[PDB]
Amino acid sequence: IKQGIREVILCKDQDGKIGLRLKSIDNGIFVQLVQANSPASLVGLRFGDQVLQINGENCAGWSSDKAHKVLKQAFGEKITMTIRDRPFERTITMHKDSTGHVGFIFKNGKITSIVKDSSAARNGLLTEHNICEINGQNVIGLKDSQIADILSTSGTVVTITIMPAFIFEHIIKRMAPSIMKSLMDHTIPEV
Structure with a gap:
């Protein structure tokens, strides 16, 4: 930010x-x-x-x-x-462990629980928060499986950008989930 x-x-x-x-x-x-x-x-x-x-x-x-x-x-x-720059968002840096985890569960991009003595726990990852980006890549409206995939195929350092669910749900309202998945820029940026 x-x-x-x-x-x-x-x-x-x-x-x-x-x-x-x-x-x-x-x-x-x-x-x-x-x-x-x-x-x-x-x-x-x-x-x-x-x-x-x-x-x-x-x-x-x-x-x-x-x-x-x-x-x-x-x-x-x-x-x-x-x-x-994204005034409603915050960025959290985590480190994967041995078993390759940062240590939360998410559904529909929304973090739902944090896992005991994890990097997510140590770094104060919040639930009820929508995942907006992973290492600077917008992930909005990718399936959960593809979000899991960006995290697996990411470095041991993982930088997530989150937004409170209430605000997330007020921004994307009246935008068809198909356009989210279909048309939203999900690319690494160019130089």
Whole structure:
């Protein structure tokens, strides 16, 4: 979680698209979906990112409709955005043991129990928290089995990014689980 605010410059692709859906939460604007191979993934936009400004206008109190409308009517040759990095999220670092465990159970991306004298226990992993990323890779709406797979095929150091269930469930609301699985950027970022 980068310790505040950064500017991004976007250029609409050939189809006039940036690869972004937005959601009104608590009178802010938050990233609900970043589409793979889009302008929004290139410049590094993330699920849970807050959009403070679009072309130097404040997003405070905008509807999801209005945020999308503004993006539609932008001479998209160039779009500035002011971003606060995933303000609703936290990052926890764990170390696998002998039997290759970090020591929780999760269902539908949501951590449901922590396991006795584990790295998850030692590091204060919380339950009722949705898994948003694993080693910087967005994992939102992958099956649980594929989440297990990123963890097995990960280094002995494991860096998980979590969001409280209540807030998770308010962001992804009115977004079909198919699009989550299908279209959300799940790639390692490019250099």
